[PDB]
Each structure stands twice: as C-alpha cells, then as structure tokens.
CSV table of C-alpha atoms and ligand atoms in Angstrom, one decimal:
chain,number,residue,atom,x,y,z
A,11,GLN,CA,-51.7,142.6,-59.0
A,12,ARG,CA,-52.4,141.1,-62.2
A,13,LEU,CA,-52.3,141.8,-66.1
A,14,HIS,CA,-55.1,139.9,-68.0
A,15,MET,CA,-55.2,139.9,-71.9
A,16,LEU,CA,-58.1,138.6,-73.8
A,17,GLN,CA,-58.3,138.3,-77.6
A,18,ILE,CA,-61.2,136.9,-79.5
A,19,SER,CA,-60.2,136.3,-83.2
A,20,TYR,CA,-63.3,136.1,-85.6
A,21,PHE,CA,-62.1,134.2,-88.9
A,22,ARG,CA,-64.4,134.4,-91.9
A,23,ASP,CA,-61.8,132.4,-93.9
A,24,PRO,CA,-58.3,131.8,-93.6
A,25,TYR,CA,-56.9,135.5,-95.0
A,26,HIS,CA,-59.6,137.9,-93.1
A,27,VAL,CA,-59.9,137.9,-89.5
A,28,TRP,CA,-61.5,140.3,-87.1
A,29,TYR,CA,-59.8,141.0,-84.0
A,30,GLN,CA,-61.6,142.0,-80.6
A,31,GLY,CA,-60.1,142.1,-77.2
A,32,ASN,CA,-59.0,144.0,-74.2
A,33,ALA,CA,-56.8,144.0,-71.3
A,34,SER,CA,-57.0,144.9,-67.7
A,35,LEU,CA,-54.5,146.0,-65.2
A,36,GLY,CA,-55.6,145.0,-61.7
A,37,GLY,CA,-59.4,144.7,-62.4
A,38,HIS,CA,-59.4,148.0,-64.6
A,39,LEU,CA,-59.7,147.9,-68.3
A,40,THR,CA,-56.8,149.3,-69.7
A,41,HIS,CA,-56.7,148.6,-73.3
A,42,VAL,CA,-58.8,147.7,-76.1
A,43,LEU,CA,-58.2,145.9,-79.5
A,44,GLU,CA,-60.4,146.1,-82.7
A,45,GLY,CA,-60.7,145.7,-86.1
A,46,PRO,CA,-59.6,143.6,-89.3
A,47,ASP,CA,-56.1,142.3,-89.7
A,48,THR,CA,-55.3,144.8,-92.0
A,49,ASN,CA,-55.9,147.8,-90.1
A,50,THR,CA,-56.3,146.8,-86.2
A,51,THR,CA,-56.7,149.4,-83.7
A,52,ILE,CA,-54.8,149.1,-80.5
A,53,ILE,CA,-55.8,151.6,-77.8
A,54,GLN,CA,-54.4,152.2,-74.3
A,55,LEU,CA,-57.3,153.8,-72.6
A,56,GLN,CA,-55.3,155.4,-69.8
A,57,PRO,CA,-52.0,156.9,-70.6
A,58,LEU,CA,-50.0,154.3,-69.0
A,59,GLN,CA,-47.0,154.4,-71.3
A,60,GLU,CA,-44.4,157.0,-72.9
A,61,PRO,CA,-44.8,157.3,-76.6
A,62,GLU,CA,-41.5,155.5,-77.3
A,63,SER,CA,-42.7,152.7,-75.1
A,64,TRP,CA,-45.9,152.5,-76.1
A,65,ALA,CA,-44.9,152.3,-79.9
A,66,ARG,CA,-42.8,149.2,-79.1
A,67,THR,CA,-45.6,147.7,-77.1
A,68,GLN,CA,-47.7,148.5,-79.9
A,69,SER,CA,-45.6,147.5,-82.5
A,70,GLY,CA,-45.0,144.2,-80.5
A,71,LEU,CA,-48.7,143.3,-80.1
A,72,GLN,CA,-49.1,143.9,-84.0
A,73,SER,CA,-45.9,141.7,-84.6
A,74,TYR,CA,-47.8,139.0,-82.3
A,75,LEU,CA,-51.0,139.2,-84.3
A,76,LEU,CA,-49.0,138.6,-87.6
A,77,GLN,CA,-47.5,135.4,-86.3
A,78,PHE,CA,-50.9,134.3,-84.8
A,79,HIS,CA,-52.7,134.8,-88.0
A,80,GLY,CA,-49.7,133.1,-90.0
A,81,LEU,CA,-49.8,130.1,-87.8
A,82,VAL,CA,-53.8,129.9,-88.6
A,83,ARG,CA,-53.1,130.1,-92.1
A,84,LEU,CA,-50.5,127.2,-91.9
A,85,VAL,CA,-53.0,125.1,-89.9
A,86,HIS,CA,-55.5,125.7,-92.7
A,87,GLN,CA,-52.8,125.1,-95.3
A,88,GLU,CA,-51.9,121.7,-93.7
A,89,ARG,CA,-55.1,120.4,-92.0
A,90,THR,CA,-58.4,121.4,-93.3
A,91,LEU,CA,-60.0,124.1,-91.0
A,92,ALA,CA,-63.8,124.7,-90.8
A,93,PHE,CA,-64.9,128.4,-91.2
A,94,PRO,CA,-66.6,130.4,-89.7
A,95,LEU,CA,-64.3,130.2,-86.5
A,96,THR,CA,-63.7,132.0,-83.5
A,97,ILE,CA,-60.5,131.6,-81.4
A,98,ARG,CA,-60.5,133.0,-78.2
A,99,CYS,CA,-56.7,133.9,-76.3
A,100,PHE,CA,-56.7,134.4,-72.8
A,101,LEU,CA,-53.1,135.3,-71.1
A,102,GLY,CA,-51.3,137.1,-68.7
A,103,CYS,CA,-49.3,137.4,-65.3
A,104,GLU,CA,-50.0,137.7,-61.7
A,105,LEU,CA,-47.3,139.2,-58.9
A,106,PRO,CA,-47.7,137.7,-55.4
A,107,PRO,CA,-47.2,139.9,-52.4
A,111,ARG,CA,-42.2,134.8,-58.6
A,112,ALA,CA,-44.7,135.5,-60.9
A,113,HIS,CA,-47.6,133.1,-62.3
A,114,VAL,CA,-48.1,133.6,-66.1
A,115,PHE,CA,-50.7,131.7,-68.2
A,116,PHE,CA,-51.7,131.4,-71.8
A,117,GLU,CA,-54.9,129.6,-72.8
A,118,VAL,CA,-56.5,129.2,-76.2
A,119,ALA,CA,-60.1,128.0,-77.0
A,120,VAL,CA,-61.8,127.5,-80.4
A,121,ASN,CA,-65.5,128.1,-81.1
A,122,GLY,CA,-66.0,128.5,-77.2
A,123,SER,CA,-64.2,125.3,-76.2
A,124,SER,CA,-60.8,124.6,-74.3
A,125,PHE,CA,-58.1,123.8,-77.0
A,126,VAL,CA,-54.6,124.2,-76.0
A,127,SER,CA,-52.5,126.1,-73.3
A,128,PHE,CA,-48.9,127.0,-72.5
A,129,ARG,CA,-46.9,125.3,-69.9
A,130,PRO,CA,-44.1,127.8,-68.7
A,131,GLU,CA,-42.1,125.4,-66.6
A,132,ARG,CA,-40.8,123.7,-69.9
A,133,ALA,CA,-42.2,126.5,-72.2
A,134,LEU,CA,-44.3,124.0,-74.1
A,135,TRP,CA,-47.8,123.8,-75.2
A,136,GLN,CA,-50.4,120.8,-74.3
A,137,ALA,CA,-53.8,120.0,-75.5
A,138,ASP,CA,-56.9,120.9,-73.3
A,139,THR,CA,-59.3,119.0,-74.9
A,140,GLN,CA,-59.6,115.1,-74.7
A,141,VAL,CA,-61.1,114.9,-78.4
A,143,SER,CA,-58.3,115.7,-83.8
A,144,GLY,CA,-55.5,116.5,-86.4
A,145,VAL,CA,-56.0,120.1,-85.9
A,146,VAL,CA,-54.9,119.9,-82.2
A,147,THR,CA,-51.9,117.8,-82.9
A,148,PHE,CA,-50.6,119.8,-85.7
A,149,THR,CA,-51.4,123.2,-84.0
A,150,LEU,CA,-49.0,121.7,-80.9
A,151,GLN,CA,-46.3,120.6,-83.3
A,152,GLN,CA,-45.9,124.1,-84.7
A,153,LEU,CA,-46.1,125.8,-81.4
A,154,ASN,CA,-43.5,123.5,-79.8
A,155,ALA,CA,-41.1,123.7,-82.8
A,156,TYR,CA,-40.2,127.4,-82.8
A,157,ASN,CA,-38.3,129.6,-80.6
A,158,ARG,CA,-40.7,132.4,-80.7
A,159,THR,CA,-43.7,130.3,-79.4
A,160,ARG,CA,-42.0,128.8,-76.5
A,161,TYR,CA,-39.1,130.9,-75.1
A,162,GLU,CA,-39.9,134.4,-76.6
A,163,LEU,CA,-43.3,133.9,-75.3
A,164,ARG,CA,-42.3,132.9,-72.1
A,165,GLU,CA,-40.2,136.0,-71.4
A,166,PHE,CA,-43.1,138.1,-72.6
A,167,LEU,CA,-44.9,136.4,-69.9
A,168,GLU,CA,-42.2,136.4,-67.2
A,169,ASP,CA,-40.4,139.5,-68.0
A,170,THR,CA,-42.3,142.0,-70.3
A,171,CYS,CA,-45.7,141.5,-68.6
A,172,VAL,CA,-44.2,141.4,-65.2
A,173,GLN,CA,-42.1,144.9,-65.5
A,174,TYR,CA,-45.3,146.2,-66.7
A,175,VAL,CA,-47.3,145.3,-63.7
A,176,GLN,CA,-44.3,146.6,-61.6
A,177,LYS,CA,-44.0,150.0,-63.3
A,178,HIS,CA,-47.8,150.7,-63.8
A,179,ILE,CA,-49.9,149.1,-61.2
B,201,LIG,C1,-50.5,145.6,-74.0
B,201,LIG,C2,-51.9,145.0,-74.2
B,201,LIG,C3,-52.8,145.8,-75.5
B,201,LIG,C4,-53.4,144.8,-76.2
B,201,LIG,C5,-54.8,144.3,-75.7
B,201,LIG,C6,-55.7,143.1,-76.3
B,201,LIG,C7,-55.2,141.7,-75.9
B,201,LIG,C8,-53.9,141.6,-77.0
B,201,LIG,C9,-53.2,140.0,-76.6
B,201,LIG,C10,-52.0,139.5,-77.1
B,201,LIG,C11,-50.9,140.0,-76.3
B,201,LIG,C12,-49.7,140.3,-77.0
B,201,LIG,C13,-48.5,139.2,-77.0
B,201,LIG,C14,-47.2,139.8,-77.5
B,201,LIG,O1,-46.7,141.1,-77.7
B,201,LIG,O2,-46.2,138.6,-77.5
B,201,LIG,C15,-45.1,139.1,-78.2
B,201,LIG,C16,-44.3,137.7,-78.3
B,201,LIG,O3,-45.3,136.6,-78.7
B,201,LIG,C17,-45.0,135.7,-79.3
B,201,LIG,O4,-43.8,135.5,-79.8
B,201,LIG,C18,-46.0,134.6,-79.5
B,201,LIG,C19,-46.1,134.3,-80.9
B,201,LIG,C20,-47.8,133.6,-81.3
B,201,LIG,C21,-48.2,132.4,-80.1
B,201,LIG,C22,-49.5,132.1,-80.8
B,201,LIG,C23,-50.5,131.4,-79.8
B,201,LIG,C24,-51.8,130.9,-80.6
B,201,LIG,C25,-52.1,129.9,-80.5
B,201,LIG,C26,-53.5,129.4,-81.2
B,201,LIG,C27,-53.3,128.6,-82.7
B,201,LIG,C28,-54.7,128.6,-83.6
B,201,LIG,C29,-54.5,127.5,-84.6
B,201,LIG,C30,-55.9,127.2,-85.4
B,201,LIG,C31,-56.9,126.6,-84.5
B,201,LIG,C32,-44.2,140.2,-77.2
B,201,LIG,O5,-42.4,140.1,-77.7
B,201,LIG,P1,-41.5,141.3,-77.1
B,201,LIG,O6,-40.3,141.1,-78.0
B,201,LIG,O7,-42.3,142.5,-76.7
B,201,LIG,O8,-41.6,140.6,-75.6
B,202,LIG,C1,-63.4,142.2,-73.0
B,202,LIG,O1,-63.9,141.5,-74.1
B,202,LIG,C2,-64.8,140.6,-73.7
B,202,LIG,C3,-64.9,139.7,-75.0
B,202,LIG,O2,-65.8,140.3,-76.0
B,202,LIG,C4,-66.1,141.2,-73.2
B,202,LIG,O3,-66.9,139.9,-72.9
B,202,LIG,C5,-66.0,142.2,-72.0
B,202,LIG,O4,-67.0,142.7,-71.7
B,202,LIG,C6,-64.7,143.2,-72.2
B,202,LIG,N1,-64.4,143.7,-71.2
B,202,LIG,C7,-63.7,144.7,-71.0
B,202,LIG,C8,-63.7,145.4,-69.7
B,202,LIG,O5,-63.4,145.8,-72.1
B,203,LIG,C1,-67.3,126.8,-85.4
B,203,LIG,O1,-68.5,127.2,-85.6
B,203,LIG,C2,-69.2,127.7,-86.8
B,203,LIG,C3,-70.5,128.0,-86.4
B,203,LIG,O2,-71.6,126.8,-86.8
B,203,LIG,C4,-69.0,126.4,-87.6
B,203,LIG,O3,-69.9,126.3,-89.3
B,203,LIG,C5,-67.6,125.8,-87.7
B,203,LIG,O4,-67.7,124.5,-88.5
B,203,LIG,C6,-66.9,125.7,-86.4
B,203,LIG,N1,-65.7,125.4,-86.8
B,203,LIG,C7,-65.1,124.7,-85.6
B,203,LIG,C8,-63.4,124.6,-86.2
B,203,LIG,O5,-65.3,124.1,-84.9
C-alpha cells in the first residue's frame, strides 16, 4: 500500500525546464508527467479520479511545479548554478496494515536534500556547497515547503491510497 512519485527536471537554463516523471500505486504505473514548464502533460493512465477531483489534483501538481521552478530560479539568482543540470524528486506515502511519508531530492544524480516530516524540516543529504545551504534555508523558511507539504504527504497522499488502491 504505497504511492510513489518520481520527477526528473531537466534544466537547460533557469527559465526552461523539461519535466519527465511518473507515479505508481502499489506497484502499478498510474500517472505520467512530461513536457516543458510552459506546457506540461499530466496524465492518469487509469481513470482513478472523477473530473472535479482530477482537476484539483492536476491543478495542485501544476501549482507545485511553479513553486518548484520558482525555487530553482531563486537559488540561481542568489547562488550561481551550473547548467545544464537535472533534478530528481522522489516522494510518497506508505500505509501499514500511521503512514510513513518521504521526499528526497537529488541533483545530477547525487543525494542533495530530504524532508524530515516529524518537524517538517529539510536536511542536507550530502557531506559536501553554498547551493545546498541556501536551498535548505529557503525550504525551511516558508509554510508551503514545510507544513503544507507535510499535509500533502500525510493527508492528501494517504487519502488517495485509501480511496484508490
Ligand atoms: C498525482 C501524481 C501525478 C503526477 C505524477 C508525476 C510526479 C509528480 C510529483 C510531484 C507531486 C505533487 C506535489 C504536490 O502537488 O504538492 C502540493 C503542495 O506542495 C508544496 O507545497 C511543495 C512546494 C515545493 C517543494 C519543492 C521541493 C524541491 C526542492 C529542490 C530544490 C532544488 C534547488 C536547486 C538545486 C499539494 O498541495 P495540495 O493543496 O493539493 O495538498
Ligand atoms: C518512471 O520514470 C523513470 C525516470 O525516467 C524511468 O526510469 C522509469 O522507467 C519510469 N517507470 C514507469 C513505471 O513509468
Ligand atoms: C551537472 O552535469 C552537467 C553535465 O556535465 C554539468 O555541465 C553541470 O555543471 C552539472 N551541474 C551541477 C549543479 O552539478
């Protein structure tokens, strides 16, 4: 009983990103993400959700991506980022027979930061940089990247597993 979500973001520069990703419910592929930031495709492969719910979910994913891209631009604006770069986000929730939730971020294929939900705080996952410290400062500064995210993992994700498995 798990929802896993995987997003790879290909940045050619701060202002143009290509997304590719998918989600799996149980061990079954259920969603696909693809395309540039200015017109991203998001598909449920199986008709799991009704339109009013899918629209809210689709809108919610699109809103996340805007925040995600906005944060990458801010980090570039404030520290110098080396392009091209790829970012991988791996996240989701698992229901035991209380849910366990996670969100792990990698840059160019190496561990970068992850979310610790008991305090809704992000931590470094590498032992090596000004980029890492500024990103964590930004992620830990705003309600949207701590408490709203924790709720998405602990409430929205968990209700999706209960309703659709
Ligand atoms: C359903 C699946 C369909 C799509 C399948 C493909 C995978 C998509 C993965 C993304 C998951 C969606 C996240 C989401 O919707 O979160 C909202 C809130 O997020 C937030 O508020 C999070 C804000 C952004 C967090 C960014 C973390 C990235 C850190 C990396 C920084 C890199 C810096 C440069 C090196 C929900 O909100 P709700 O209201 O629906 O509940
Ligand atoms: C999901 O995307 C990853 C990353 O590109 C890919 O390696 C994997 O084969 C995809 N899996 C599914 C089930 O779509
Ligand atoms: C990521 O890898 C590309 C490919 O070599 C490189 O040009 C770029 O500088 C790297 N960026 C980071 C942030 O490691």
